[PDB]
Amino acid sequence: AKDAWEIPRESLRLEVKLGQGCFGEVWMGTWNGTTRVAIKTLKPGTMSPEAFLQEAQVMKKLRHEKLVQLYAVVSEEPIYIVGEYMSKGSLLDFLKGEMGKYLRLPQLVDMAAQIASGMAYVERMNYVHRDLRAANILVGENLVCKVADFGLARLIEFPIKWTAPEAALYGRFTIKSDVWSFGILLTELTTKGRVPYPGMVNREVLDQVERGYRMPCPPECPESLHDLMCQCWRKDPEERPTFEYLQAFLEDYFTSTEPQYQPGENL
Numbered sequence: 001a002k003d004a005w006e007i008p009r010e011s012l013r014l015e016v017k018l019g020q021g022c023f024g025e026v027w028m029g030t031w032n033g034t035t036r037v038a039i040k041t042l043k044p045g046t047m048s049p050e051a052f053l054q055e056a057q058v059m060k061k062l063r064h065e066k067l068v069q070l071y072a073v074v075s076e077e078p079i080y081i082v083g084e085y086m087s088k089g090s091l092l093d094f095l096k097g098e099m100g101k102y103l104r105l106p107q108l109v110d111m112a113a114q115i116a117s118g119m120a121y122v123e124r125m126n127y128v129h130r131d132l133r134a135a136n137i138l139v140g141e142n143l144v145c146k147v148a149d150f151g152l153a154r155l156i157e158f159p160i161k162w163t164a165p166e167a168a169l170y171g172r173f174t175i176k177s178d179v180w181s182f183g184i185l186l187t188e189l190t191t192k193g194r195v196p197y198p199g200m201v202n203r204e205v206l207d208q209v210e211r212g213y214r215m216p217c218p219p220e221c222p223e224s225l226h227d228l229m230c231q232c233w234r235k236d237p238e239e240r241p242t243f244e245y246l247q248a249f250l251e252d253y254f255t256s257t258e259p260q261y262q263p264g265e266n267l
């Protein structure tokens with residue numbers, strides 16, 4: 001047979017390495033000498049397809065403005081994956097970078113809104129991400145944010161700190177378990193890249209969380225946004241808000257929730 005996304009190898013041209021990985025690397029290049037693309041290569045032979053194209057198989061059935069776009073694939077060795085190019089790289093690196101110092105609440109909340117918007121689409125498609133966090137979020141020009149990295153992210157039929165209890169203990173990955181991760185993601189944005197649960201390892205946090213402990217309101221962060229985190233951190237996953245609620249709440253934040261927001265030294 002043949003693949004509808006399959007393009008010839010001579011259609012692209014790798015130029016600049018964007019960052020090596022433990023399963024390959026990412027390259028900026030030109031598709032047909034006109035299309036600016038981002039090629040995800042392969043480093044043999046750890047993976048070594050399981051299939052490695054499963055990253056793309058899901059990116060075929062999904063399409064949204066807040067999701068990183070799939071362009072094409074290459075089935076023969078060396079295996080390649082062509083897709084949308086995000087100039088600023090990972091959100092985590094971006095927050096930890098120089099720009100993180102100048103980011104304030106308006107920009108941070110707006111970025112979360114886009115992610116919530118992207119995840120709202122995923123919610124409508126009846127899909128789960130299973131690894132929603134700042135490291136898996138690509139940022140481009142004009143502070144645009146797009147959901148990325150779809151490993152084993154499938155239908156409905158170890159980042160423990162970002163993972164919901166029922167998903168870590170019983171493997172019950174739902175769209176409501178992604179909401180949990182979104183609440184953790186909101187702490188990463190309000191701390192500008194700090195690892196959640198500071199001074200706390202995987203075993204002690206899982207026990208502490210199961211007992212009912214939740215992360216405190218981060219410095220300069222308003223109570224209204226912290227409450228949203230707690231809603232996402234409710235023990236019973238059915239009570240967690242939808243991404244439809246999350247997107248709408250964030251988009252209308254500085255008008256309907258905090259109309260009297262005054263900038264601080266960090267937020």
Ligand SMILES: CC(C)C[C@@H]1NC(=O)c2c1c1c3ccccc3n(CCCCN)c1c1[nH]c3ccccc3c21
Nearest residue numbers: 018019026038040081083084085086087089135136149
């Ligand atoms: C559409 C796809 C093939 C390429 C995507 N486009 C980029 O510009 C880009 C991309 C990825 C990506 C995709 C899938 C899995 C991991 C990926 N990574 C590693 C980051 C850790 C993810 N949790 C990427 C990355 N890293 C950067 C650094 C600087 C500039 C651009 C990218 C950059």
